[PDB]
Scaffold this active site. Sequence first.
Site, mmCIF file in Angstrom:
data_model
loop_
_atom_site.group_PDB
_atom_site.id
_atom_site.type_symbol
_atom_site.label_atom_id
_atom_site.label_comp_id
_atom_site.label_asym_id
_atom_site.label_seq_id
_atom_site.Cartn_x
_atom_site.Cartn_y
_atom_site.Cartn_z
ATOM 1 N N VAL A 73 0.829 -1.196 0.000
ATOM 2 C CA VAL A 73 0.000 0.000 0.000
ATOM 3 C C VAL A 73 0.865 1.247 0.000
ATOM 4 O O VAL A 73 2.049 1.189 0.330
ATOM 5 C CB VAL A 73 -0.896 0.051 1.227
ATOM 6 C CG1 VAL A 73 -2.134 -0.787 1.006
ATOM 7 C CG2 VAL A 73 -0.129 -0.409 2.463
ATOM 8 N N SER A 74 0.265 2.378 -0.357
ATOM 9 C CA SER A 74 0.978 3.654 -0.418
ATOM 10 C C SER A 74 0.015 4.808 -0.209
ATOM 11 O O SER A 74 0.425 5.943 0.032
ATOM 12 C CB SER A 74 1.705 3.798 -1.756
ATOM 13 O OG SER A 74 0.928 3.268 -2.816
ATOM 14 N N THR A 75 -1.273 4.490 -0.298
ATOM 15 C CA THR A 75 -2.342 5.451 -0.086
ATOM 16 C C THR A 75 -2.471 5.765 1.409
ATOM 17 O O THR A 75 -3.341 6.544 1.812
ATOM 18 C CB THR A 75 -3.697 4.919 -0.636
ATOM 19 O OG1 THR A 75 -3.476 3.805 -1.515
ATOM 20 C CG2 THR A 75 -4.451 6.021 -1.380
ATOM 21 N N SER A 76 -1.594 5.157 2.214
ATOM 22 C CA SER A 76 -1.578 5.302 3.680
ATOM 23 C C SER A 76 -2.958 5.046 4.307
ATOM 24 O O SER A 76 -3.410 5.779 5.197
ATOM 25 C CB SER A 76 -1.011 6.670 4.094
ATOM 26 O OG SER A 76 -0.850 6.758 5.499
ATOM 27 N N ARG A 99 2.801 -2.866 -7.600
ATOM 28 C CA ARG A 99 2.835 -3.286 -6.218
ATOM 29 C C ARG A 99 4.123 -4.006 -5.910
ATOM 30 O O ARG A 99 4.517 -4.117 -4.754
ATOM 31 C CB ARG A 99 1.640 -4.174 -5.905
ATOM 32 C CG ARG A 99 0.329 -3.433 -5.982
ATOM 33 C CD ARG A 99 0.436 -2.095 -5.298
ATOM 34 N NE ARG A 99 -0.523 -1.156 -5.851
ATOM 35 C CZ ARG A 99 -0.744 0.060 -5.365
ATOM 36 N NH1 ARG A 99 -0.069 0.495 -4.303
ATOM 37 N NH2 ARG A 99 -1.649 0.844 -5.941
#
Lengths: 183, 182, 182, 183
Positions: A9-12, A68
């Site tokens: 993930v990176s959208t926190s 990802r």
Amino acid sequence: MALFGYARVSTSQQSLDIQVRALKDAGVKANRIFTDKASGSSSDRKGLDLLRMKVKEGDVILVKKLDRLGRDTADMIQLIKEFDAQGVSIRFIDDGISTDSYIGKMVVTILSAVAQAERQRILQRTNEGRQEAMAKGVVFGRKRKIDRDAVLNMWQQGLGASHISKTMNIARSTVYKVINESN
Amino acid sequence: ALFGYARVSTSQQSLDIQVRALKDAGVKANRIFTDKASGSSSDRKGLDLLRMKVKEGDVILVKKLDRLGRDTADMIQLIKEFDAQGVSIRFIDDGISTDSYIGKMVVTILSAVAQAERQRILQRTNEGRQEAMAKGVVFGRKRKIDRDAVLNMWQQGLGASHISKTMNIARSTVYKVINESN
Amino acid sequence: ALFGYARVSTSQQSLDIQVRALKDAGVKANRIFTDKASGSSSDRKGLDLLRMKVKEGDVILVKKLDRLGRDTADMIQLIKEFDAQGVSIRFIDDGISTDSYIGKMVVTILSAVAQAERQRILQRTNEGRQEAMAKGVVFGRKRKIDRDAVLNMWQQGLGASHISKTMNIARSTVYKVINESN
Amino acid sequence: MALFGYARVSTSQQSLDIQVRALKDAGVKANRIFTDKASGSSSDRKGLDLLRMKVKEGDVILVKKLDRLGRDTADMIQLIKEFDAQGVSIRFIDDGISTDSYIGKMVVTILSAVAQAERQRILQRTNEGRQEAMAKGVVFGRKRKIDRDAVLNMWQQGLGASHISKTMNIARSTVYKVINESN
DNA sequence: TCAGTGTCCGATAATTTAT
DNA sequence: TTATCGGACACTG
DNA sequence: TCAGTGTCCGATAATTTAT
DNA sequence: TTATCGGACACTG
DNA sequence: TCAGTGTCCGATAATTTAT
DNA sequence: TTATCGGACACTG
DNA sequence: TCAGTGTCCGATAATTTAT
DNA sequence: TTATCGGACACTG
């Protein structure tokens, strides 16, 4: 033989749940998944480094989509090459290719650099649309959560600065910043 | 500033035919760099030099794109270095420079699709060879010495040393010849 | 059912080297089809035949992919036809079949990147030629007749007809020779 | 010289406004745009056929994204080839290429068939996720907007069918369908 | 001069599925 | 994909 | 009856640039 | 692309 | 035995921009 | 990107 | 002092499969 | 890849 799932993930956010449920869905075991969350720049995707270690010749890693298994293309290939050296392929579920064979890997490289170029352009917009609002008098970042009118009141009424920060449970420096800023 | 890098991996002098292609594309000889590659990955010392003698505003020309890199992962590193160094690479034959941000994309596709076809050739060569090999094809250097001679001496019972002296050939050879032809 | 199509556009007999590559890939000669192409687009009559004699469950082999199509727009039509007809094409050298739905994508990329490089060659050839041409390179068929002969007769004032009879050469030639060499 | 903008929609909505405002934005004239709406299968994108006609050697067409200059790749190339024959290039604004030169066109073909393959897969999902709901007893299509309980009441109470359709301003056939269905 | 009945069907309308 | 509108078409009074 | 002059041109063969 | 070949065509003797 | 003051800064927090 | 927290660091009593 | 037997091996040259 | 070359090494006389 052995089937490992990676997620990221990176959208926190808890966007994480959808990804892992697609792995388990496509025949992974809970005790064979690894995840990484976005911390910042240095964030060395710890879990993945572990993944590399407990997989052996004749395994496969599953990844939801493509972006990802690492960010930019350069990494993506190195990353892949690392695996292909231990003798391990990667299925990307939604994108449909596999690090299984020569012809695949190419597609992954192509498919990658198409987006890593499509990325660089979204920025140029997201940026321009950001700056346009800037000069249009839009206020950016964290909202001023301090009663600053109330602290200007303290110093003007000649009083010790530390004492001030002891009366609102706030940082000392902040009080200096506040006033050294707003005069 | 107009720079030209070149490369040859056949272990051939095909270099002079490539270097002209840029000498004729405007590049002066003071500003060309080459590399013979003959067994390792550190033999890009001629590029190591270029990689420094360049500055911002320069452009380096390369004939075909597959001379600059090897595998696409090397390719991108090479581009990337020059990139944020402020130089650009322009591929003569292919007809792309890394100038536009979209050049870079091509430069990557264009190659990873080569690097595919390149790897196919390898796989298809080994088998083509291995095939020939078993089918009866003799390999390597041609046998040049008259072997039927050396054996004659030995079957006639003559100390090895003598034999290598009377054909001015290597002693090991004598032994090899007879150690092999029995 | 195992089918093989082939093609040759150099106007050469390179056909027999391609047809073997499939004869050795399992295809029987009753089930191979070819095409000499020598000036038009309707000369795929050998394929026109295949395009019908096939059924659902069949597979056609082609050596390299660029033999089946020409431009990628022809490519896709050809694929598309066979596709919803129920047959599949498998490209021997390249190592793809249209079997998977993702094969098709490759088959398109793989080629449109060829068709690019193909068009580049054309552009790069014309100029390479045009260049040579002006630089002094004689072109076309080699002059074979001893021209210094024919002229001698004429400068010696001898009716044209006679000349074409005493070298068993074409009259137009005589006239051409002297009409040209003045 | 001459700069023409094409736009299109298929979402059967006013999505159209954003597109045209990006053309005019990037230096087009209102009197140089053409649009087409989605009707169905046959919808022969009339406007575009006209576009082809009033452009000449040394023009450029602008298109927002890619999948707006025709649907599938096969068309896309033919379409392009048609233009390239009249001597006309196409800039695609957001995607950033141009039918300007050899090397571009390729990218357009590649970039295209990447998606026309990525498309075919979204379907396989949108479809599967459709069917899964079907057997799960989900009701599909147009909602039954007729008071059918009230029309069954008419026929059972022996009365002429036409008369019925004359009392609710409805189609005759429908009344036959209704009852011939629900017995 | 039409007059009403019972089928079978292209054309629009209003919906739904997941990116 | 499912629901309604308009009709053309074959019988029958 | 038939013989020659000179211009044109379609049908082959020969050769070339570049990979 | 150029070269060489038969062979048609319009005049001429 | 610390005791308070005035700078300059990495680390987290809370925000915003457009796909 | 901008706002706050904790501190280390140099003076000064 | 020095001469020969026989096994191994690094350093070149020679040749090959396939485009 | 194999061939041929000098040249090291361990024994032997």
